[PDB]
Amino acid sequence: WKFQRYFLVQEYCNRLNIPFPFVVFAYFYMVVKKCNETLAWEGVMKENYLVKINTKANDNSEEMRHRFRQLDSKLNDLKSLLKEIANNIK
């Protein structure tokens, strides 16, 4: 119904906004007579949308795995440093 109603709404935009029986006079009168910022706002909204989809797609799923990876890497580095200092002691 909505798609069908679009055409009905469109049809009356082009008219002269006069009742049908009296629009003949308007037609005759016409015959005698003849002879940027919004785009910037759109870009801003696109910025927010792209953030919404990209970050929500990637970071939300990858955060836990990144946390585990960083924890493991940091612990391994600290263990290696402790081994180095222990070797230096002896």
Which residues are at the interface with a second copy (CB under 8 A)? 1-9, 12-15, 17-21, 23-24, 27, 37-52, 55, 59, 63-72, 74-76, 78-79, 82-83, 85-87, 89-90
Tell me how far apart the alpha carbons of residues 44 and 82 are, in angstroms, rounded to a whole number.
50
CB of 80: closest distance to a second copy in angstroms?
8
The distance of closest approach from Cβ of residue 3 to a second copy in the complex, given in angstroms and rounded to an integer, is 5
Neighbours of 7 (CB within 10 A): 8
DSSP state for residue 15 in the 8-state scheme: S
Determine the Cα–Cα distance for residues 7 and 9; give it in Å rounded to an integer.
Answer: 5
Shortest reach from residue 70's CB to a second copy, in Å: 8
